[PDB]
Design a protein around this ligand. Structure first.
Ligand SMILES: NC(=O)c1ccc[n+]([C@@H]2O[C@H](COP(=O)([O-])OP(=O)(O)OC[C@H]3O[C@@H](n4cnc5c(N)ncnc54)[C@H](OP(=O)(O)O)[C@@H]3O)[C@@H](O)[C@H]2O)c1
Ligand SMILES: NC(=O)c1ccc[n+]([C@@H]2O[C@H](COP(=O)([O-])OP(=O)(O)OC[C@H]3O[C@@H](n4cnc5c(N)ncnc54)[C@H](OP(=O)(O)O)[C@@H]3O)[C@@H](O)[C@H]2O)c1
Ligand SMILES: O=C(O)CCCc1cccc(C(=O)O)c1C(=O)O
Ligand SMILES: O=C(O)CCCc1cccc(C(=O)O)c1C(=O)O
Ligand code: NA
Ligand code: NA
Lengths: 357, 359
């Protein structure tokens, strides 16, 4: 069996990493929980076992077979390369290594083949991107993809435990104390690292992550660049608008595509239904469509509102929802680890391709 | 001055119609508040005056110059024609008359010209459509519009007072009592008239109004059909996805357009800023963009996140926000009434062009 380390075990994603590992088939002989110095020494459960949280350091990965990193880009940048040096296979939830050509960027249902040539780090994509890939890959396979326009409806847990608590506090101030939403004080959303913070309570914030030089945010650009890498097609046109709404868990997306060939809607629905990881929830006669509150806790990605554009021959609209902490993060990561296991890819990497920092 | 009736004075739009009329320049000599049998006999303020609410009837409109209808499509269907027969000019907030070729469908900044040939009923468009037209008309004027793709983020007050109360109740049960969102009981949303109801708390519901036979909802098709009528151009391709989110007031929209000619983004920003009713809130260096919570209470429509598409030469994305009860409803209606006054258009229509529904 394996020694598995969870780096960032105490955070929003870390908690779901724990749950997904507890529910995994992976043969785990030893579990280790790693975090920052301030969590080191506390106890956290794995099933019935009490695990003592350890501080994350350059020398903490000896004996580890698989390390699941969800502690922030800076933590991955600093320590993942030392984990690889120590013989670990790293599955990284952060954005840091995603565009490195030596790093596979994987959604197992779409591009598991990219795992075979790994150099010790496999990157989990952005949550918003992952669910969109699960919905669209079965369409791309049969009729191609020319372009995507997506507008997202993103849950606050994507921004971490602090953002969840900020959202809850803000809502209670409005509902219980009668504070006007525009008068609330915020410290985290829309982006912890950016200069100004705004209320999310009763709001829709069109900013996720920080702005890039082209006036799209880094979240929007991740959707663009990660799609192209995952689907191995730089020709796919992708533009995104990423919006935070007052939902704690599960991202929803209004997705428009144009296919390369006309894709009859009944066949599109069937192709999505048949695709592993995708569940068709589409029966408008009974008001059946994907819903954030229904997706919470499920590893599947739910797709509905599927319909032809009113004018564009090859245009199709749909609604895609998944739990952003599960398929969008912890489940995608555990599924990668399970796929590595299946393929006999859990083993030390001989060549070090990642500079030690 | 005028005798003005507000039909549906007691609901979510009605409260804002009252506020907008209190703050209006319209010379009002008399106010009457009309609603259903349920509210008849109750009292409601106009400024410092107590106004007794009346049941809406066939015979309620004698002496009325202007009637603002916001009581539901059936109520407009039943009583607006009798108002017109009585000599009233009706401003109707409902969908009922919007696609009637005898009825102007007006956003005053865009197509006030359509008011001149009115036949006693002027229709206010759907709230989601109105704010989109305010944002896009200045772009259309300079560079044309070939298509629109819109995904909306709609506040619950668009579904009425009941939906507001339902949303607050649900949120309190979750936040204060620890109820799981999927265990919530809903009675109204997504659509009061439809068969099944779902929680909105911590949810996003991709259904506004009921489904039509092409699998778009009526809300989505309204954005399509109303845009084409308001802009007087059937060739504009419009497809919409309309979604309810946990916001009480102000609708937000992610709007994609393709223009006919390449529209430089800095010029687009300037054209929108310069257009009456539109305010540019677009300074990403200081994280300035429209926000529902800032839009509440303002008659203006706020536009930002303006940027070219990453691939389509003539593609532009933006973010549009307005208070759905103000520019989306009560303010657009009062602004129509003020525009009718400016143009000498508040007077009886001699020829009745609308079916009377009460034999
Ligand atoms: N805000 C604080 O002052 C504070 C205090 C204690 C803990 N934290 C951690 O950070 C989060 C605070 O809210 P959040 O929204 O930021 O959490 P979050 O994004 O949901 O989770 C961040 C996770 O990354 C870990 N992490 C952060 N820096 C690290 C480092 N240098 N080395 C190894 N692991 C690291 C955290 O462990 P740690 O828990 O050890 O940080 C935590 O498990 C907590 O979940 C908690 O995990 C923060
Ligand atoms: N332009 C837009 O986008 C827009 C936006 C929102 C609403 N609207 C229109 O306005 C309507 C009402 O919206 P709301 O949000 O104010 O709804 P609401 O909060 O539910 O209020 C409904 C109003 O309609 C009145 N009413 C109901 N049945 C009636 C009847 N048989 N006769 C006379 N009055 C009656 C109610 O009176 P009681 O209190 O006596 O029941 C109340 O004043 C909607 O159905 C829609 O057509 C348009
Ligand atoms: O808004 C959301 O739904 C969450 C986005 C996830 C996220 C949050 C902070 C930092 C990073 C990052 O590693 O850059 C990432 C990421 O791209 O995975
Ligand atoms: O819910 C929203 O945010 C927008 C829908 C407003 C609305 C609600 C019920 C009935 C009608 C209607 O008159 O059909 C209308 C309308 O189109 O004005
Ligand atoms: Na302006
Ligand atoms: Na005049």
């Amino acid at each position: 069996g394996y020694t598995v380390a969870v780096v960032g075990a105490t955070g929003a994603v870390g908690a779901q990493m724990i749950k997904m590992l507890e529910e995994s088939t992976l043969p785990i002989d030893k579990i280790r929980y790693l975090a920052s110095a301030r969590s080191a020494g506390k106890s956290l459960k794995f099933k019935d076992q009490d695990i003592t949280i350890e501080e994350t350091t350059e020398t903490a990965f000896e004996g580890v077979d698989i390390a699941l990193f969800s502690a922030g880009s800076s933590t991955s940048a600093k320590y993942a390369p030392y984990a690889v040096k120590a013989g670990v296979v790293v599955v990284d939830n952060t954005s840091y290594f995603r565009q490195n050509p030596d790093v596979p960027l994987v959604v197992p249902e779409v591009n598991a083949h990219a795992l075979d040539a790994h150099n010790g780090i496999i990157a989990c994509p952005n949550c918003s991107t992952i669910q969109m890939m699960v919905a669209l890959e079965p369409v791309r396979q049969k009729w191609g993809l020319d372009r995507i326009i997506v507008s997202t409806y993103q849950a606050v847990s994507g921004a971490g435990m602090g953002a969840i608590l900020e959202t809850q506090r803000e809502l209670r101030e409005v509902l219980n104390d009668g504070v006007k939403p525009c008068d609330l004080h915020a410290e985290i959303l829309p982006s912890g690292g950016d200069k100004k913070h705004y209320p999310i309570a009763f709001n829709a914030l069109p900013q996720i992550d920080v702005f890039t030089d082209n006036d799209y945010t880094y979240e929007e650009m991740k959707m663009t660049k990660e799609t192209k890498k995952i689907m191995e097609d730089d020709s796919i046109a992708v533009s995104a608008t990423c919006v935070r709404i007052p939902v704690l868990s599960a991202h929803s997306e209004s997705v428009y595509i144009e296919t390369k060939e006309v894709a009859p809607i009944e066949e599109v629905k069937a192709a999505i239904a048949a695709f592993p990881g995708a569940v068709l929830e589409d029966d408008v006669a009974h008001q059946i469509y994907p819903q954030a509150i229904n997706a919470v806790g499920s590893r599947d990605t739910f797709v509905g509102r599927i319909r032809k554009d009113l004018d564009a021959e090859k245009g199709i609209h749909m609604w895609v929802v998944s739990d952003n902490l599960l398929k969008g993060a912890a489940w995608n990561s555990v599924q990668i680890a399970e796929t590595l296991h299946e393929r006999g890819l859990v083993r030390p990497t001989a060549e070090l391709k990642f500079e030690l920092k």
